[PDB]
């Protein structure tokens, strides 16, 4: 279709490696057809000549052709598999960069409406199946078409009415069987995918709700409709396996019609010859050997639908506009912050909650604001506006008497270092996990900062060479929390936003971090957002808020009196 237009421009970056992988597919298929066609003719020509015509018949040339066609068949297929797979991996790099460059400016906002679980696993499975457009679809379709044309052109030097029936049948199934079978199996492809995700959600809600289904007795009758979805789902997989049966049986009948037509028509006469002799087998063995060019064709076009499916599931995901835009004013980050937001009344999309009811607070440079609010207060939503995940409507956020919107992304990210509640281990070497904060940091600085934070068990063995994340030295909560703080210390931003630094930590670690925060993040404006009441005594200011509104503010006291 036309959904592939943005992605066919990525295949054009490497267009001489994809063309070489198709030319080698044509050469290999022409060598397979030529080897059997020449072998079929060589047997007939020599048998007719017989012993009497030994000296008259020149067998050296056909004997060199079978050796030549056999070598280019084996070497051609080896290099066609190498060149076409190598070009597939090169385009894969361009598909991944293109997908990542598009999903990045909309990382917090656009992907929030979907669910991160399936969405992120779907993008990887759709980029992987866009990468297989060349091998599954283009290479078999274009390799077959040129092979059909060259065979038809080559056989027209012998008989015109014979080359256009073998070429005519072969072309009439390259353009008819793939569409007639994509159209025949389109409902099943939709029905099967709908029933697969329907069984998945009926199974997840049957497993996750097994405690609440067993007690009320519905565990048996909610499995009965779970097994009736599978019965319907398995009947939509059989109907898809009966279109592969019909396509292989029909392709065997069309390759049988061409062989039988060549036996009948070419025996009547080949090129105005009453007794063609050895030319009967040249056309019969061409029809026999020319239909493995059409073996991949019918399963290639159904693959185009799956590629069309995945080419639009990404081209709408990557074409939704970014929530915020960063003007490239080329500003310079200041040494101090003095964060001030006069008024911020912000509401989520498709939500009437309106978490910020127009709050106001002023932070001076070096202060240690500690916003307190129970769960559901939308206190973390305040930290979203400061990093500009969402821009507020009818709100004013200023940063050193300059609005947050005026700062370019290159300087805003350097002005504010935030430690998120969910800290992500990048599944890379520990040196590559903390150089994310500050790329220019020397190797000595990494060890020192990782020491002062208290992560000494990481530097004990292979401290900067060990592999963290998946398939490596996984970190635990409270040992991963010191990594988020370690990154914020490398980043050295004047403002430090902490989002629940001690949400799930025991007494001994929480006490360390609160001192860990105050000792090192001492000259830096800190705006810490928690629902815990322990360490607020060292903060120069405390903000107590409920349902996006400031109730108890200006309390230099340890905590809200009632909260104690």
């Amino acid at each position: 279709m036309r959904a592939l237009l943005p992605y066919l421009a990525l295949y054009k970056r490497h267009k001489w490696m994809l063309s070489l992988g198709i030319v080698l597919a044509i050469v290999t298929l022409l060598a397979s057809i030529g080897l059997l066609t020449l072998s079929g003719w060589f047997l007939s020509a020599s048998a007719v000549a017989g012993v009497a015509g030994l000296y008259s018949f020149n067998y050296m040339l056909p004997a060199a052709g079978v050796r030549g066609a056999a070598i280019t068949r084996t070497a051609g297929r080896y290099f066609e598999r190498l060149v076409s797979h190598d070009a597939t991996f090169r385009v894969l790099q361009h598909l991944r960069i293109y997908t990542f460059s598009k999903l990045l400016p909309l990382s917090p906002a656009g992907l929030a409406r979907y669910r991160q679980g399936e969405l992120l696993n779907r993008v990887v499975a759709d980029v992987d199946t866009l990468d297989h457009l060349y091998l599954r679809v283009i290479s078999p379709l274009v390799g077959a078409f040129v092979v059909i044309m060259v065979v038809t052109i080559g056989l027209s030097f012998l008989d015109f009415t014979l080359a256009f029936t073998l070429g005519g049948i072969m072309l009439l199934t390259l353009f008819l069987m793939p569409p007639l079978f994509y159209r025949a199996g389109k409902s099943t492809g939709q029905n099967l995918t709908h029933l697969r995700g329907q069984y998945r959600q009926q199974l997840t809600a049957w497993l996750q709700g097994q405690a609440e289904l067993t007690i009320f007795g519905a565990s048996d009758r909610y499995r009965t409709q779970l097994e009736n979805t599978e019965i319907q789902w398995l009947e939509a997989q059989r109907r898809q396996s009966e279109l592969t049966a019909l396509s292989q049986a029909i392709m065997l009948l069309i390759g049988a019609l061409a062989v039988i037509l060549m036996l009948w028509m070419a025996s009547g006469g080949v090129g105005g010859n009453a007794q063609p002799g050895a030319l009967i087998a040249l056309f019969v063995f061409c029809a026999l050997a020319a239909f493995e060019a059409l073996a991949p064709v019918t399963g290639a076009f159904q693959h185009l639908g799956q590629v069309i499916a995945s080419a639009v599931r990404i081209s709408d995901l990557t074409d939704q506009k970014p929530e915020v835009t960063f003007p490239d004013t080329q500003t310079r980050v200041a040494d101090r912050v003095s964060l001030t937001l006069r008024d911020v009344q912000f509401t989520y999309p498709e939500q009437s909650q309106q978490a910020l009811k127009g709050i106001s607070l002023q932070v001076n440079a070096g202060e240690h604001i500690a916003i307190l609010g129970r769960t559901g207060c939308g206190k973390s939503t305040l930290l979203q506006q400061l990093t500009r995940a969402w821009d507020p409507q009818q709100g004013e956020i200023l940063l050193n008497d300059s609005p947050i919107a005026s700062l370019n992304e290159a300087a805003l990210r350097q002005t504010i270092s935030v430690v998120p509640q969910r800290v992500h281990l990048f599944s890379a070497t520990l040196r590559d996990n903390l150089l994310l904060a500050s790329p220019g940091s020397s190797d000595e600085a990494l060890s020192e900062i990782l020491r002062r934070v208290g992560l000494e068990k990481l530097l004990e063995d292979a401290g900067l060479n060990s592999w963290l994340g998946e398939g490596g030295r996984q970190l635990s909560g409270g040992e991963l929390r010191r990594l988020a703080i370690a990154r914020a210390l490398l980043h050295d931003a004047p403002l430090v936003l902490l989002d629940q630094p001690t949400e799930g930590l025991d007494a001994t670690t929480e006490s360390q971090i609160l001192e860990l925060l105050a000792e090192m993040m001492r000259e830096k404006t800190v705006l810490m957002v928690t629902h815990r009441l322990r360490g607020l005594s060292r903060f120069q200011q405390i903000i107590v808020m409920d349902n996006g509104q400031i109730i108890e503010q200006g309390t230099h006291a340890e905590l809200l009196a009632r909260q104690g």
């Binding site: 047997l43 960069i97 059989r238």
Partner: protein, 565 residues
């Protein structure tokens, strides 16, 4: 040792459809027979009109028979892998019934161990990985040994030299694959670690884009994707130079065989070579039979190469499935007794141990008595097995000890009829019905609407009904039709209170709920905990003064048993 043991498992599963896996072997033999019949008829026709110049219409009988051999082949091909699918569907349908029977019986205690996403790859992805092994690999593994051997038997009476070119490559193909298999397996272990941490590199960076933006590394992790994609290509293109050499060996011997057959026959008809034929001049029809069948000899082994990838994934998917069925499980004993009355029951326990399905004891020796129809809150430290006692009373955990319900040991009680007197309100709200109207009526789906309305307002689920688009029948599926946590919990309360119960269990109902709903959840339950004996585990120590008994549970033991004194 293990991979051999997994393959033996895949054989034990392939018994439901052994009838369907025998017709794929039989139709492989029949499809092999029709190839010789096709090839022999074509040679008979071709020789007649080439050597004996017999016209088209005098060969009308072989043409009529050659069509049948072509129609029969197409029928067998259509018939052969419809039988193959029917074979592979029956393993998938039978095993998926065994997996679900293993999960339903294991109960919610064992199910909750893993995320429901990792359970639904076992039931959906792992099991469907095994179809193309019983449907396409196993049938083809036996068509790759019959058809090549059946073709040689057909050629041998004609020539022992044309049937020796084909049979000559039979030992050489697996011999040369082993030589290239040493180099391949060397690169499959050197590059195995690097390609395991580079394959999941994109999804690694693609997830955690929120951490990449907040540090400004968005433009510098494009270069990482560029280096992790250039390094994954170079390493895979080292593995593939050897995986396409083993594949291309079969393509080398299928064209050497056609070249040798064509040259040997072509030279034999000229007089240079005369060793193959049985002292009778080799005929044109004897050279077409061997040339037509030379590509058909290697086709079964070529298809087997493409379907061989299904062999590996069905063994990997048999590793996850086999260990799942070989985990020992301790599950509650199926009782047979019943409850005489629906009057609220009395709980009693002495030296009670609660055993996990894994086999460990969560709650140590604990003894308590709960008189009929008296609420009793159970508060304790986190991780101290306080929630395990609620599961053991529900019948989800097996216990060694004494736990009798109303004077009858809980082991003897039939779960189907014991849970008719039981109601529960979990910590996280889990709504398994399609519509919000059927979630409330989950206890009994045919209850009168007049009664339902009295149950809806009791739990105060009706106050936020207008906010929902469709009202009572608003779809409540987890995707795009959700409710608030304090809203999907107030409908779990209505589900619990619709049908009166003898024992009602509460597992931290007011957790991670907004202050607005927490007020209406509790006072809906604080009035529902008096009609029947209630055992609540609460996180908040506040406002428990009007609770008959308090048990403090530390390390799975009742240490402080008091009345909020």
């Amino acid at each position: 040792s293990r991979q051999k043991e997994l393959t033996r498992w895949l054989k034990q599963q392939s018994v439901i459809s052994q009838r369907w896996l025998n017709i794929s072997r039989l139709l492989g033999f029949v499809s092999g027979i029709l190839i010789i019949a096709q090839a022999w008829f074509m040679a008979r026709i071709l020789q007649h009109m080439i050597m004996e110049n017999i016209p088209r219409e005098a060969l009308l009988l072989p043409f009529t028979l050659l069509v049948l051999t072509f129609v029969l082949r197409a029928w067998v091909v259509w018939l052969r892998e419809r039988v193959g699918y029917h074979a592979g569907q029956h393993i998938r349908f039978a095993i998926r019934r065994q997996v679900l029977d293993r999960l339903q019986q294991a109960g919610p205690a064992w199910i909750q161990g893993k995320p429901a996403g990792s359970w639904a790859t076992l039931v959906l992805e792992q099991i469907d990985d095994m179809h193309d092994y019983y449907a396409r690999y196993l049938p083809q593994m036996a068509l790759a040994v019959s058809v090549p051997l059946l073709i040689v038997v057909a050629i041998f009476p004609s020539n022992w030299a044309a049937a020796l070119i084909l049979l000559g490559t039979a030992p050489l193909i697996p011999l040369f694959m082993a030589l290239v298999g040493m180099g391949a397996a060397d690169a499959n272990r050197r590059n195995f670690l690097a390609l395991a941490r580079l394959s999941g590199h994109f999804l690694d960076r693609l997830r955690g884009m929120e951490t990449l933006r907040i540090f400004g590394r968005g433009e510098a992790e494009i270069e990482s994707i560029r280096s992790a994609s250039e390094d994954f290509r170079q390493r895979t293109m080292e593995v593939l130079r050897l995986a396409f050499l083993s594949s291309g060996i079969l393509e080398f011997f299928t064209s050497l065989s056609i070249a040798l057959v064509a040259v040997y026959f072509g030279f034999s008809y000229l007089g240079e070579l005369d060793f193959g034929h049985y002292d009778t001049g080799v005929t044109l029809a004897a050279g077409f039979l061997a040339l037509i069948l030379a590509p058909e000899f290697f086709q079964p082994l070529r298809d087997l190469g493409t379907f061989y990838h299904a062999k590996a994934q069905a063994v990997g998917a048999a590793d996850s499935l086999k260990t799942f069925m070989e985990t020992p499980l301790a599950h509650p004993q199926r009782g047979e007794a019943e409850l005489a009355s629906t009057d609220p029951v009395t709980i009693e326990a002495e030296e009670l141990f609660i055993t996990s399905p894994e086999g460990k004891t969560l709650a140590g020796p604990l003894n308590f008595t709960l008189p009929a129809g008296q609420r009793a809150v159970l508060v304790g430290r986190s991780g101290s097995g306080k929630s395990s006692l609620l599961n053991a009373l529900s019948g989800f955990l097996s216990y060694q000890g004494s736990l009798r319900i109303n004077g009858i040991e809980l082991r003897d009680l039939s779960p189907e009829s014991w849970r008719k007197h039981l109601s529960w309100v979990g910590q996280n709200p889990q709504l398994p019905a399609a519509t919000l109207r059927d979630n409330v009526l989950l206890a009994r789906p045919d209850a009168s609407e007049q009664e339902l309305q009295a149950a809806l307002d009791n739990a105060w689920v009706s106050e936020f009904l207008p906010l929902l688009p469709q009202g009572v029948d608003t779809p409540v599926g987890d995707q795009a039709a959700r409710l608030s946590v304090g809203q999907a919990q107030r409908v779990a309360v209505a589900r619990a209170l619709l049908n009166p119960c003898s024992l009602l269990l509460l597992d931290e109902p007011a957790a991670s709920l907004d202050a607005h709903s927490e007020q209406r959840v509790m006072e809906a339950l604080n009035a529902a905990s008096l009609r029947q004996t209630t055992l609540m585990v609460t996180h908040q120590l506040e406002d428990l003064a009007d609770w008959d008994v308090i048990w403090v549970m530390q390390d799975g033991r009742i240490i402080e048993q008091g009345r909020y004194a």
